[PDB]
Amino acid sequence: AQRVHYRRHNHYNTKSNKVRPVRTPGGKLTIHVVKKKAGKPKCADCKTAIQGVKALRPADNYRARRKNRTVARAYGGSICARCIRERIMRAFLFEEQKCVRQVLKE
Amino acid sequence: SRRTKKVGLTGKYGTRYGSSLRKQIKKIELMQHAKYLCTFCGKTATKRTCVGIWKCKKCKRKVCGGAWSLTTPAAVAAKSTIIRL
Amino acid sequence: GSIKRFRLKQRLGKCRRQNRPVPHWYRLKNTKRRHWRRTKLGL
Amino acid sequence: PKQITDIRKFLKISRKPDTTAVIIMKKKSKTVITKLKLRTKKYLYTMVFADRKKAERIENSLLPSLKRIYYP
Amino acid sequence: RLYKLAKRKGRHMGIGKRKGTKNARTNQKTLWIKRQRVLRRLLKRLRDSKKVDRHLYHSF
Amino acid sequence: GRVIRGQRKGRGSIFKSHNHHRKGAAKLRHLDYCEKKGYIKGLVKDIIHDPGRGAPLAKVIFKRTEKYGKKEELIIASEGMFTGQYISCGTKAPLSVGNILPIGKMPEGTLICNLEHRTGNRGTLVKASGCYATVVGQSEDGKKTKVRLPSGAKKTIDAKARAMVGVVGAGGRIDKPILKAGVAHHKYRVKRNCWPKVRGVAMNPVEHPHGGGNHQHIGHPSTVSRSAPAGQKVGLIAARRTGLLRG
RNA sequence: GUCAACUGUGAUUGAACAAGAGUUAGCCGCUCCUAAGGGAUAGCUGAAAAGUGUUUAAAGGGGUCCCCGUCUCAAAAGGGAAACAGGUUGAUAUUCCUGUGCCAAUAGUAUUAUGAGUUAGAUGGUAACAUAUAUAUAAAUGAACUCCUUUACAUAGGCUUUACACUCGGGGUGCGUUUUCUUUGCACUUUACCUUUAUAACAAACCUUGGAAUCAAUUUACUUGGAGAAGAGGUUCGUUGAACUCAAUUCAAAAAUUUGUUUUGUAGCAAUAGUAAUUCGUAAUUAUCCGAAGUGGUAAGGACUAUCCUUGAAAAAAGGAGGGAACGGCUUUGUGCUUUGCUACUCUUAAUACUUGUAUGAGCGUACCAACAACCGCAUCAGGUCUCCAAGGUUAACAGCCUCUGGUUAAAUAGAAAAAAGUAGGUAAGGGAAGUCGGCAAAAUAGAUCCGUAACUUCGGGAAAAGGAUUGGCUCUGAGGACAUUAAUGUUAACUCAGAACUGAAACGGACAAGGGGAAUCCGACUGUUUAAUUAAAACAUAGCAUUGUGAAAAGCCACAACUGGUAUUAAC
């Protein structure tokens, strides 16, 4: 076949240096170092990835259009829909329950 | 079909080690991987994830527990004693 | 190695320069000489 | 490199100041077809013209001052 | 290519010609998985086409 | 000879604690007005493991008493407590599992942990897995309180020292035997270099007082005085008695 | 160039000698961040030298008088702004050249143009959530103060998806064998970054509806469900990176701009570039560059499951949200504020002009060897020395044997002769351990399928026990799938199994590969480890058992001259 070799001045097979064989239009089989796969961004309460938000690294998250980073809805790309829904309910329910309790108490 | 007359869970250790030693391990391991009933939901999904830490799969909630069980008898007696007052 | 620090590179050049034999017209008016293989620079 | 589809958008780029060059290329495939490439400093935009008559009229239509390259 | 055409025609799979354990010759696990997929595939078609009842499907 | 194996262990070189994955110290919420005069309720947000000890650690959030917003502490977890439990701390806190109360306000015969050996010290007795202390009495003029540490000694502390209602987590840990050497290797790997042990009598004389001879015999008494000097302290240190137990 | 010496033989050679020459980066690194840690500051000790690192700190920054807060070094394999293809030289190239991009800066002031909002903060969507396509997706008010998240992580096992690799068949080119046979054997048939790449596809997750026991759905694996399943319709991330009629176009049927049918384009990048050919000058042309599929060797991902008295770094840096501080422009009486008069204003990219020190990309590395002669071993020393790439046949096989790409055909010598002896090997009639301290050495065995398998046992094992049989080549037979037509009828894929003939000097795991076994005793439970260059063991370690001190900073145990430390980010399990 053909063989490949590192071109980027650090040849060890470390997690950030993983490498993908690719053929050139020169008919040469060459090597490319593919970027690191990145974690999904997670809800504050439940540590679970949130819809719409792209999983971009701290370099790529800076360059993308703003719409990719967040959700037009309450605590956006920082709390998920299920938790927010439950939280909104708590915020009403306890406030009523507290007022009732005070009225009862006197 | 029925693999072992005795050994069960501790069969992994094989011909090595004392039978008495192995028996003592067998009781604790049977207890260890046992699925506890989760009193935050009513499913039998509570498992041990690390030495003292018990997670329910359904509730995604961490109960603090014993080394080899969800509840040690010492704690149960203490809990009851508190409850009575 | 491939890489060097600048002081080290400059020094390696200095040694190389030092080797260069005595100029031929001067003899018409040597004893000390680095050779690479068996006589390491060490520095 | 970017691919244009709208003839009007192509014309719109064509009028503008930083659109330095028009790079035009015509070739066989099986019959003749035309690739029209425009060179803006920011990008090289390409439009694929499948009919000679349209291509001929548009190549004529352009502002003539704008630089012209043929590959051969 | 000639040898391979002959192997297709079944000519060198005899007991002496083999040189490895049966599981190494072909993996038992893969064979099972193949078979389970064939049986599941048939069942999904039978339920989708509505030519069995759900209850019968589940038992099968 | 040369420095003996016991002495080398102390000296602050390689035998320093295996720091690296430890999650930070476990010490109670420090004493303030808000606790002293009442109660403060906090949230357990998480229970997290620790490479050092059997007990899990409990991630506790309070809201600050003189500044906006939430501040996180690490408490050592009582058995039977849980994520999303409200944890209460203070003089008026109710007797209930995993709350933090002054020992002066315990009813007798309660089981507790996280004793402060002297007040305000953020908890320093009863922290290892499955331990507990028992409260055994309150003096007539109050002010002092009598408790029992799990070793078997009775001790008298100030009343306003903290403790935590309920037994320490991870009970029964040494019930399970360690079957194979590698498990023991892994146990010590996250603690301190102290293992495998090496029998002193098998050493050369130069390294240790039991060394030498031709049958690995101890060759002189195995009990050495409390008064013994540094390199001499060998086998059974200052022992009251030797041989099997009775009570 | 060249042969004084060296290149252990020769030598016109050469890693020798001589003369010149060569290393080009915003993107590849260093450079920045923190880790194990190091060195200092405050103290304090100490004659000093030094030993300590917040232990009596008026100490480094952020907001605009308040709030944070040791400094500094320590990764060329952790974290980490951004780059690829082709070509080119005697010697460099992700660095020069040509093309194409990408990333980061990009001051003030004034003009212009780009779109927003307004008569001080847009809309859609039931929802999950979606929305700016401007030469450019620029632009969707937001202070203090907060709260998160990404950065950012173990191991094992399988499953699955894509990529590359390999293979097969067909068309096209060239070449080869071509006595005989050979619709043949072989070669070539190329496609990058970049375009939030456009879409499709798929594992999940989530939503709307729906209301489930004769439980259901369901994976290789088990998982999941009234805390809402199946079903039906959706929304998103992640893989992927032109899949899919994708886009453009055409005609037919539509709405005051859609569905159906056709034509194009290797989706742009892209053929002008490569490669194989073919001619003519002696540079120029022409022709080619594409229809089906399989194997699963690599690598990445996905969804997962299991394992742990082990739970598997940190920050720099970036992002999101909570919160609601601040808020037209112009003219003007009066002390940024108040009342009068007027309406195109506030944002925001990009370009331009002018001033402001000279207003775009700093410095350093980049030759060559990397051992076979460039390293270390006193040297051109059969030694030692870190990482990635991984072709065909045979095969369990990245083994061993032979082969293609690529490399070499040289080793501190050659020829001729051929004896003892040596050394690395073969092989031996008949006997079969009689040799020897000692079956040491050597040999026998061995691959697989099918059978058969004891004492004893902690019931797990012993066990491949022991002990048998079979195995080639040929010619057949049976078994095992996938699709799509309206039960039958068709198209169509692999390799593995099982059975039967015939055939031969009874041979066939033919080479290579590859267990000697049994009956007992002694010691050591075991796996583990050790005397580097005389001892691998019965020594040592180990789990378990047993013992002892110690309740704490006036303690245990231990280090230090001293102050001070360590065990201790600890606490009787």
Contact F93, F39 (CB under 8 A): yes
Q: Is the peptide bond before D72 cis (omega within 30 degrees of 0)?
A: no
Contact F104, F14 (CB under 8 A): no
Residue A42 class from Cβ within 10 Å (0-12 exposed, 13-18 middle, 19+ buried)?
A: middle
Taking the C-alpha atoms of residue C33 and residue B82, their distance in angstroms, rounded to an integer, is 93
* B25 close to F (CB below 8 A): yes
Interface test with F, best of B64, B70, B72, B85 (most F CBs within 10 A): B64
**Residue F205 Cα distances to A71, F2, F98, F198, angstroms:** 74, 9, 53, 14
Which DSSP state fits D64?
S
Chain B residues with CB under 8 Å of F58 CB are 64
Q: Does residue A2 lie within 7 Å of nucleic acid chain G, judged by its CB?
A: yes
Contact B59, B67 (CB under 8 A): no
- Phi and psi angles of residue D19, each rounded to the nearest 5 degrees, phi first: -80, 75
CA neighbours closer than 13 Å in the CB half-sphere of residue F206: 2
Query: Which residues make Cβ contacts (< 8 Å) with residue F44, sequence separation at least 6?
Result: F58, F59, F60, F61, F81, F82, F83, F84, F85, F86, F87
Task: Quickly list DSSP for chain E.
Answer: -HHHHHHHTT-S-STTT--S-HHHHS-HHHHHHHHHHHHHHHHHHHHHTT-S-HHHHHH-
Using the Cα atoms of residue D52, residue D54, residue D58 and residue D61 in order, give the sign of their dihedral.
positive
B25 with F54: Cβ contact below 8 A: no
Residue C37 CA distance to nucleotide G11 C1' (Å): 22
Resolution of this model in Å is 6.7
CA neighbours closer than 13 Å in the CB half-sphere of residue F189: 7
**Residue F214 Cα distances to D1, F52, F204, F220, angstroms:** 87, 41, 11, 14
**Burial code of A11-38, b = ≥16 C-beta within 10 A, e = fewer?**
eeeeeeeebeeeeeeeeeeeeeeeeeee
Mapped onto helix, strand or coil, the DSSP state of residue A104 is helix
B52 with F176: Cβ contact below 8 A: no
Residue E24 class from Cβ within 10 Å (0-12 exposed, 13-18 middle, 19+ buried)?
A: exposed
Taking the C-alpha atoms of residue F14 and residue F192, their distance in angstroms, rounded to an integer, is 9
Instruction: Tell me which nucleotides of strand G come within 7 A of a protein CB.
Output: 15-19, 28-29, 35-37, 68, 76-82, 84-87, 94, 99-104, 122-125, 127-132, 134-140, 145-153, 158-160, 163-166, 168-169, 185, 189-196, 205-207, 214-221, 223-227, 235-239, 247-249, 263-275, 285, 287-288, 299-302, 307-313, 316-322, 364-370, 374-376, 379-380, 387-391, 393-397, 447-450, 458-462, 470-483, 495-499, 508-510, 525-528, 539-553, 556-560, 565-573
| Helix (H) / strand (E) containing D28 | strand D19-28
3-state secondary structure chain F: CCCCHHHHHHCCCCCCCCCCCCCCCCCCCCCCHHHHCCCEEEEEEEEECCCCCCCCEEEEEEECCCCCCEEEEEEECECCCECCCEEEECCCCCCCCCCEEEHHHCCCCCEEECECCCCCCCCCECCCCCCCEEEEEECCCCCEEEEECCCCCEEEEECCCEEEECCECCCCHHHCCCCCHHHHHHHHHCCCCCCCCCCHHHCCHHHCCCCCCCCCCCCCCCEECCCCCCCCCCCEECCCCCCCCCC
Using the Cα atoms of residue F153, residue F154, residue F157 and residue F163 in order, give the sign of their dihedral.
positive
Q: Which chains touch A (3 or more CB pairs under 8 A)?
A: none
Contact F216, F201 (CB under 8 A): yes
Contact F122, F27 (CB under 8 A): yes
Taking the C-alpha atoms of residue D61 and residue D68, their distance in angstroms, rounded to an integer, is 13
**Cα-Cα-Cα-Cα dihedral of B56, B62, B68, B74, to 10°?**
-120
Mapped onto helix, strand or coil, the DSSP state of residue B4 is coil
Å between B42 CA and nearest CA of chain F: 16
Taking the C-alpha atoms of residue B52 and residue B67, their distance in angstroms, rounded to an integer, is 5
- Structure-token pair, residue E39: 């049986």
Which DSSP state fits C21?
P
Contact D44, D37 (CB under 8 A): yes
Q: Give the residue from A84, A64, A65, A82 showing the smallest Cα distance to A74.
A: A84
Taking the C-alpha atoms of residue B47 and residue B69, their distance in angstroms, rounded to an integer, is 9
| Helix (H) / strand (E) containing B56 | strand B53-56
Taking the C-alpha atoms of residue F89 and residue F39, their distance in angstroms, rounded to an integer, is 5
Tokens 């262990």, located at residue: F9
| Helix (H) / strand (E) containing B84 | helix B73-84
Taking the C-alpha atoms of residue F37 and residue C28, their distance in angstroms, rounded to an integer, is 105
**Count of B-F CB contacts under 8 Å:** 110
Contact C18, C34 (CB under 8 A): yes
- Please name every residue paired with B53 in a beta bridge, in sequence order, or none if there are none: B50, B64
Q: Does residue F178 lie within 7 Å of nucleic acid chain G, judged by its CB?
A: yes
Taking the C-alpha atoms of residue F26 and residue F117, their distance in angstroms, rounded to an integer, is 15
Amino acid present at F79: E
Residues in chain C: 43
For F:2-31, CB contacts with B below 8 A are none
Q: Does residue A102 lie within 7 Å of nucleic acid chain G, judged by its CB?
A: no
Nearest to F81 among B40, B50, B64 (CB): B64
Experimental method of this PDB entry: cryo-EM
CB atoms < 10 A from the CB of E43, how many? 15
Contact F87, F60 (CB under 8 A): yes
Query: Which residues make Cβ contacts (< 8 Å) with residue F183, sequence separation at least 6?
Result: none
**Residue D21 Cα distances to B47, D40, D45, F60, angstroms:** 70, 7, 11, 67
| Helix (H) / strand (E) containing D3 | strand D2-3
Q: Give the residue from F138, F106, F125, F136 showing the smallest Cα distance to F28.
A: F125
Å between F54 CA and nearest CA of chain B: 7
* Angle value at C-alpha B64, between B63 and B70, nearest 5 degrees: 80
CB atoms < 10 A from the CB of F187, how many? 11
B51 with F170: Cβ contact below 8 A: yes
- Structure-token pair, residue D22: 């028009």
Contact F129, B67 (CB under 8 A): yes
Taking the C-alpha atoms of residue F165 and residue F53, their distance in angstroms, rounded to an integer, is 20
Which DSSP state fits D15?
H
Residue B25 class from Cβ within 10 Å (0-12 exposed, 13-18 middle, 19+ buried)?
A: buried
B67 with F77: Cβ contact below 8 A: no
**Residue F151 Cα distances to C40, D3, F131, F133, F155, angstroms:** 69, 81, 9, 9, 11
Taking the C-alpha atoms of residue A6 and residue A13, their distance in angstroms, rounded to an integer, is 10
- Structure-token pair, residue D20: 């330095």
Taking the C-alpha atoms of residue F62 and residue E10, their distance in angstroms, rounded to an integer, is 77
Taking the C-alpha atoms of residue F110 and residue F166, their distance in angstroms, rounded to an integer, is 8
Q: Does residue F246 lie within 7 Å of nucleic acid chain G, judged by its CB?
A: no
Contact F61, F72 (CB under 8 A): yes
* Angle value at C-alpha F132, between F126 and F135, nearest 5 degrees: 100
Amino acid present at B81: T
**Residue C24 Cα distances to C30, E22, F11, F33, angstroms:** 11, 83, 68, 95
CA neighbours closer than 13 Å in the CB half-sphere of residue C8: 8
B65 with F169: Cβ contact below 8 A: yes
